[PDB]
Amino acid sequence: DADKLPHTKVTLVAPPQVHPHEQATKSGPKVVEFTMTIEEKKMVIDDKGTTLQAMTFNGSMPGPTLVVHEGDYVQLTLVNPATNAMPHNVDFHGATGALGGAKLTNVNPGEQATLRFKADRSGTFVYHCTPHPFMSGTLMVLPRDGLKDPQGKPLHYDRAYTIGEFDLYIPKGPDGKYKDYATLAESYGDTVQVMRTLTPSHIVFNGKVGALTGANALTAKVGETVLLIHSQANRDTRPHLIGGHGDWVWETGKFANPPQRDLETWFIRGGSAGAALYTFKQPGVYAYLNHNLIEAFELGAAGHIKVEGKWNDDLMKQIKAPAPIP
Amino acid sequence: DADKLPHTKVTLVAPPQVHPHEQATKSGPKVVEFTMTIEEKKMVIDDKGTTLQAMTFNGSMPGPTLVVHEGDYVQLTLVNPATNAMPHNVDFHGATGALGGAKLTNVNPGEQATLRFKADRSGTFVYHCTPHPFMSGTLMVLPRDGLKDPQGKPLHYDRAYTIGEFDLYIPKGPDGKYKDYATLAESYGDTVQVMRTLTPSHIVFNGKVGALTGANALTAKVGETVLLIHSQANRDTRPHLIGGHGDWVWETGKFANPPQRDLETWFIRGGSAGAALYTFKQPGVYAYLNHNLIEAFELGAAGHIKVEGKWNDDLMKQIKAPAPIP
Amino acid sequence: DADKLPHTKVTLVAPPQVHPHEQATKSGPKVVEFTMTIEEKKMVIDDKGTTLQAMTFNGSMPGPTLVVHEGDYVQLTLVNPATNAMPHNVDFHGATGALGGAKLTNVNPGEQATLRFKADRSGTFVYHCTPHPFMSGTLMVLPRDGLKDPQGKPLHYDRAYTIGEFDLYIPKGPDGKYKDYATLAESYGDTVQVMRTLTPSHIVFNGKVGALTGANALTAKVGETVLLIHSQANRDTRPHLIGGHGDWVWETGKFANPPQRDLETWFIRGGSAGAALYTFKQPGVYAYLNHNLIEAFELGAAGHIKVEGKWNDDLMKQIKAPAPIP
Ligand SMILES: [Zn+2]
Ligand SMILES: [Zn+2]
Ligand SMILES: [Zn+2]
Ligand SMILES: [Zn+2]
Ligand SMILES: [Zn+2]
Ligand SMILES: [Zn+2]
Ligand SMILES: [Zn+2]
Ligand SMILES: [Zn+2]
Ligand SMILES: [Zn+2]
């Protein structure tokens, strides 16, 4: 029985980080306790001041990544302060029954509720508010013994990074400029019309064109293995590490399945999270992007990863530098 | 030789049902005989009276699902009554040679023809009229010994359901309202222009926004295993069972391949059929949908499954009901 | 060490052909030397004279396919004559570090450079100019022992064919006709606006609506096994052999992974190359196409394969020819 089990309380962190956690664990089924605070707000989403009338779990797009193990129970306290304007809920793709929890978690402003479900299937899993993919994140459910390659050999990551990718549908006034709305409710009707064209005005990693560039680049060092968790609650995307690979990729994001190796580009189905391991072998700046290069370069779906360490001439070498043609 | 074999005659049924059939079978290679009647007609496809100038196999979108076993031969009598206006044919993705049969089956109004081909590859397979994905269905070819999991362990379904998903491209007049055409031939030119924008006006399960909702919901009981066969002859879709999973999914729909487990969302390539098993564990209403939530909610790609049985507190429990914040 | 190894010089050929090469090889790690000449030019891309302001490796879309083995080193001399107008580079998805080589290969008109990298991961891999998917091709890296099926059984192809698929975004003037630009630089601004709609004006195999039809059809004979290499540096496509199958398909295009069998339609992620084997069993004309039939028929993503040999009545037979209804 679940009630008769130990309870742990987890402190969540902002994306792109994932809270500290154990991979392989001698430990036993726990009930893991999480709390999240829904937050409506306006956000600047590009370099030119365009705003989005947003809804978030915990203030961030994406919401934070919750981590448990196969067999653990997730118990989430979902809070929706009075400072907000709408009901909300949460649908956990990792959970079974009641529209993934959506039905047991409808909370008006100033309300709260608490859900428990068995996390009995390993993998990365999207949770989102039932009709809003803008409010989403990843539930990572690790197998009790850690990640395994197709032959059962152990696998691991030294650091985890979390990337939620968002297709945005921002309306334009008669002048051709993006509309700014005073409330969430007023954005609604125009946004739907733009959504019906199926053409995003913007596709952003982590809230904003550039969220994962400049001072905000991800980081690693040569010899380090990194887990890239990629979620997209609404639209297909195709992650690619420029100059890298996915050493082992669960593109459908479910750990009881063997991963694929050596991927150049993988595929995240809209309504899901997937996961890729890469061990760095060269230093420098990498681009992690959506390999529709229009969606990446023109619309916003690209980030960087600054990698420290020693250059390897065996893997790659500049034989003749750029020079005039003989 | 095929001629020297026993012949069976199968009675087809309307979607979402699949005609009664054997899974694992001690039986031997049969020649299975099917007949289909092509039918052009106008259809109401949404809640507001929008019509589509349609073509169907057997009166329904999708056409009925034909079921055989690996090694069986499909022999189809394709009929096109005089009451119709165009030639038609059938391309079976399950068949080898002659454009999947398209070349041996061109039938003008008042004509008919009969095709046989070896069904020598297991899987769910799309058949459609050569230039019209609107006229399509699934050929399920079962392995002679039934469905197998990745380790060879036997698998099964207690009931099969069939979902054909259709991207529709309905033209608008200068006033902004959907055009109504008196014939199939007059819809053609405007529809092509809208098709060239690659933006469906509608994406429907089984003919109509709502075909699989209300009184028409699919049905199951807790402890039952259901096969969800999903076909899309023209455009990519991404099925998801809200509150459920795909326990075992052949997303490319070919049974000699190991299935994947625990999928939250799977992917059907345009021009194919895939297949998912789910064993229910909770009662209530589920939504089976295209997890581009614009395509589902705004455009029409969503259905329901009403599930009877006993609630399970272990899997999911409401710990604190929605209540004011302390 | 790489410098201490034998060097081979390979002569490249125009698509759809792939230069002669060994599959399984008793031979040892070589350093393979390739040279490519970048070429800007205007091209006619459809039947009605529409032009594209193009950039190519070696004069062709796609660029030629480079073939090596796992363990070999690729050393490419990249040349950009003075007759051109822009810098260019190359990003090899098969390579590790320095943005796949892009950083070590920026070459202005009249410059050249030479890159070496270890090809240490088997598979088909896209190489392209960093911001232009129009300039792309495939690096096929074969496993040293040849293609293997999921059980380790040997596989082979008798001939290889190469298909690069290109989504084109051609601007229209106020009259509704495609714009013709005098330089590459003048096409830029209008093209970007059209790209931002994410709606190709054209999707072409190998440079041109029809490049792989009529006298230019691919060819085979019954009993022959063919490798279809399919690359798409920018957008998702879904190859399908009408009347055929993918006997063994590495849709993510990476050979250390087991292939899937019996596929009706496969999926190439934008930013990747995949690969399918088919052994012909029937003669006639086949269509190899993108199974979004709008993208194929209306936009240009379809080709033919003329197959010689003996008709097989076991696989497929016309039982009753088209005839009046009794
Ligand atoms: Zn909400
Ligand atoms: Zn490590
Ligand atoms: Zn969902
Ligand atoms: Zn037809
Ligand atoms: Zn059962
Ligand atoms: Zn087809
Ligand atoms: Zn370039
Ligand atoms: Zn051969
Ligand atoms: Zn690339």
Report the domain count for chain A: 2
Q: What single-letter DSSP state applies at residue B298?
A: I
Residue C326 domain-assigned? Answer: no
Nearest to B113 among C295, C314, C321 (CB): C321
Q: Let me know whether A149 and A121 are in one domain.
A: no
Q: Let me know whether A150 and A135 are in one domain.
A: no
**Which CATH number belongs to the domain containing residue A156 in this structure?**
2.60.40.420
A-chain CB neighbours of C5 within 8 Å are: none
Which ligand has the minimum distance to the alpha carbon of residue C154?
8
Q: What is the CA radius of gyration of chain C?
A: 21
Q: Which of A124, A143, A162 is the last residue of a domain?
A: A143
Q: List the domain range (segments joined by +) for residue B196.
A: 144-310
Extended strands (E) in chain B = 7-9, 31-44, 51-57, 66-69, 73-80, 91-92, 111-118, 123-129, 132-142, 159-168, 202-205, 218-221, 225-232, 239-242, 246-250, 260-263, 272-279, 284-290, 302-308, 316-324
Residues A90, A76 contacting (CB under 8 angstroms): yes
How far CA C104 is from CA of A67, A323, C99, C129, in Å, comes to: 40, 12, 9, 12
Residue C322 domain-assigned? Answer: no
Residues B268, B203 contacting (CB under 8 angstroms): no
H runs (alpha helix) in chain C: 184-196, 293
Residues 6+ apart with CB under 8 A from A177: none
Which ligand has the minimum distance to the alpha carbon of residue B239?
3
Residue C104 domain-assigned? Answer: yes
Beta carbons within 10 angstroms of residue A61's beta carbon: 27
Q: Let me know whether B169 and B298 are in one domain.
A: yes
Q: Let me know whether A43 and A149 are in one domain.
A: no
Q: Let me know whether C262 and C160 are in one domain.
A: yes
Which of A54, A287, A33 lies closest to A188 in space, CA to CA? A54
Residues 6+ apart with CB under 8 A from C28: C6
Residue A317 domain-assigned? Answer: no
Q: Tell me how far apart the alpha carbons of residues A235 and B144 are, in angstroms, rounded to a whole number.
A: 38
Q: Tell me how far apart the alpha carbons of residues B165 and B266 are, in angstroms, rounded to a whole number.
A: 14
The encoded tokens of residue B198 equal 């690659």
Residues A282, A222 contacting (CB under 8 angstroms): yes
Residue A320 domain-assigned? Answer: no
Q: Annotated binding site: which residue ranges of B? A: 7, 33, 69, 72, 88, 91, 93, 128-129, 135, 156, 158, 186, 272, 291, 298, 304
Q: Let me know whether A189 and A42 are in one domain.
A: no
Q: Which of A143, A171, A187 is the last residue of a domain?
A: A143
* Chain A residue whose CA is closest to C78: A322
Q: Let me know whether A283 and A207 are in one domain.
A: yes
- Please give the distance, rounded to the nearest whole angstrom, from the Cα atom of residue C140 to the centre of ligand 3: 38
Q: What single-letter DSSP state applies at residue B11?
A: P
Are the Cβ atoms of A322 and C105 closer than 8 angstroms? yes
The reply to whether omega before A259 is within 30° of 0 (cis) is: no
Q: Let me know whether A213 and A86 are in one domain.
A: no
Q: Is C14 helix (H, G, I), strand (E, B) or coil?
A: coil
Q: Let me know whether C60 and C152 are in one domain.
A: no
Q: Which of C92, C127, C143 is the last residue of a domain?
A: C143
Q: Let me know whether A94 and A166 are in one domain.
A: no
- Please give the distance, rounded to the nearest whole angstrom, from the Cα atom of residue A286 to the centre of ligand 2: 19
Q: Let me know whether C192 and C127 are in one domain.
A: no
Q: Tell me how far apart the alpha carbons of residues A115 and B71 are, in angstroms, rounded to a whole number.
A: 50
* Chain B residue whose CA is closest to C313: B117
Are the Cβ atoms of C271 and A282 closer than 8 angstroms? no
Residue A322 domain-assigned? Answer: no
Residue A321 domain-assigned? Answer: no
Residue A325 domain-assigned? Answer: no
Q: Å resolution of this model?
A: 2.5
Residues B46, B211 contacting (CB under 8 angstroms): no
Q: Let me know whether A198 and A258 are in one domain.
A: yes
Give me the residues of C, 7-66, that contact A with CB < 8 A: none
Query: In angstroms, how far is CA A203 from the centroid of its own chain?
Result: 13
Q: Exposed e or buried b for every residue in C283-312, given b needs 16+ CB within 10 A?
A: bbebbbbbbbbbbbbbbbbbbbbebeeeee
Which of C163, C168, C284, C180 lies closest to C227 in space, CA to CA? C163
